[PDB]
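User: I'm putting together a teaching handout on how multi-component assemblies are represented. Below are the sequence lines for each component of a complex, exactly as they appear in our records. Could you produce the 3D structure of the whole assembly as C-alpha cells, so the students can see both representations side by side? Please keep the chain order the same as the input.
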Amino acid sequence: SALIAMIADEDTVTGFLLAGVGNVDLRRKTNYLIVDSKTTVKAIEDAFKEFTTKEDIAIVLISQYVANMIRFLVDSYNKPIPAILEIPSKDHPYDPAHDSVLSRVKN
Amino acid sequence: TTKESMGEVMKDSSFALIEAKYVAGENIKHIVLENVQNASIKVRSRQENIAGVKIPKFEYFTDGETKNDLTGLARGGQQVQQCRAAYVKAIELLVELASLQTSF
Amino acid sequence: AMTFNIHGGYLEAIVRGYRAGLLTIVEKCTLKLVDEYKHMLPLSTFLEYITYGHMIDNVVLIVTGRDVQELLEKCHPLGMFDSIMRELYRLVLVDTPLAPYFSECITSEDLDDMNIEIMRNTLYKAYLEDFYKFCQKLGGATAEIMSDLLAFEADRRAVNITINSIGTELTRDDRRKLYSLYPYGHEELAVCEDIDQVRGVMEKYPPYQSIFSKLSYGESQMLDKAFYEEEVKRLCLAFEQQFHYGVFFAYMRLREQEIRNLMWISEC
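Assistant: Of course. Below is the structure of the complete assembly, with chains in the same order as your input.
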C-alpha cells in the first residue's frame, strides 16, 4: 500500500517522499512529516504501531538508532509486516542497537 | 545481500543531496520540500503462501504499484538515481525481512 | 565619474568595504549580509533589485499556500522582506516589483505555482519583473552585467524546459516566454526540441558559452543550474571591483556566493 516514516534524518526521505503524487504515502495528509529530531522519536514508534499497523503504510524508517530512540519499538519485531525498518546512514551512519527490526535482522 | 546493499544505498543517496545543494541550494522545504523527481510513495503488498506458510510480499516504493514521477529537478535525476534506488532496495529488504521472520 | 566624489562617496566606500570583507551556516551568513544591508539602509538601486529578487523567492514561497512563516523566518530578512493564495500574491505585489509578474504567471495562485514545475514558471516571471526593476536603473555597466546574468538564467530555464518540462506539458512558446533584452530573445536554444539537441544550443548562448566548458554538472541539470559556472564567473566579474560605479548588487551576489560556498563545504 504505502510506507510512512514520519520521523527520520529526512535528507533522503524528502527526496523519497513524493514527486508527482501518492501523497507521500499519506505522510502529509495523515500521520506525520518525515522530518525528525524536533521531538522524541518514540512517538514515531507509537505512530508506526498506530498508523503503519493500520494497513495504510507498510514500513517505517529510523536513522542510526543512536538518537532514533527506537528501543520503544524493540517489541515491534513480532509481526514484521506492520513494523519493518532498516537503519540507513542519511548523514547519520547506522549504529547497531535495539530497534524495530535491527535485532531480528542482525540475528 | 540486501543488507550488504544497505548503507552503500545511503552513501549513494547523500550524493543526491550534495548535488541538490550545489545546483538548487536550499530545498523547497515545508509541504513541498523539493528534492524529488521520481519514486512517489505508493506500494502493493500481499501475503503469499510459500512452503505452506503465508509470506507477505512487501513491495515498497520504487517497486510497488502506483509509483509516480514529476519530471526532473536540477538534482532530480541524482535523487532518482540515488534516493529512488534506495527505495527499490528497501522494497526487497522489507519483503525479505517479513518472509525471513515468518519462516524462522 | 566625478559624481561619486561630489556625492555618495561614503556610502560607496562602506559598500566596497563590506564587499571586500567577504570572500544553518548559509542562513547565518545571509542573515548577517541582510543586517549589514539594513545598517547601510546608484548602487542602492542595484542592491534594492537584488533584494527584490531574493524577496521574489520568499514571496513565491509565501504565495504558495506547513510552517510557511517559520520557513520565511529561517530565510534571510533581505530575502524575507518585512514589508512584503491569491490574496498572498496580491499583497506580495505591493512593495516588491518582482511579485506581480509571478502572480500574473500563476493564474491559479498556489496551484499554478506548484513546486514541481509551475513554481518554476512563477519564479521565472518574478525574476523577469526583478530584471525589469534592475533595468529601471537607466542602464550602466552593472546593468549590462545584470542583463548577461538574466540571459544566462533564461537560457538555463529554456534548457531545463526542453530537458524535462516537456513532460510537464509547458508549451514551447510558453516555456520560451517563461524563459524570459538579452534574456528576452533566446530562439536559438528553443529551436531544438530534443533535450540533447537543445542542450548544445543553450550552451551556444554567450552567457553559457566558455563558462560551462565540459558541464558535467550544469547544462545537463534542470531548473536553473545550466549557468552555474557562469554564475561563478559573474561573481569573478565583481572580483574586478572597479570603483566609482554601482556594485552593491555585486557585493550582495558575492556575499551570497560566499555563503553558498560555506554551505557546500559544510563539515570539513
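A couple of points students might notice: DSSP finds 14 helices and no strands in chain C. The radius of gyration of chain C is 18 Å.
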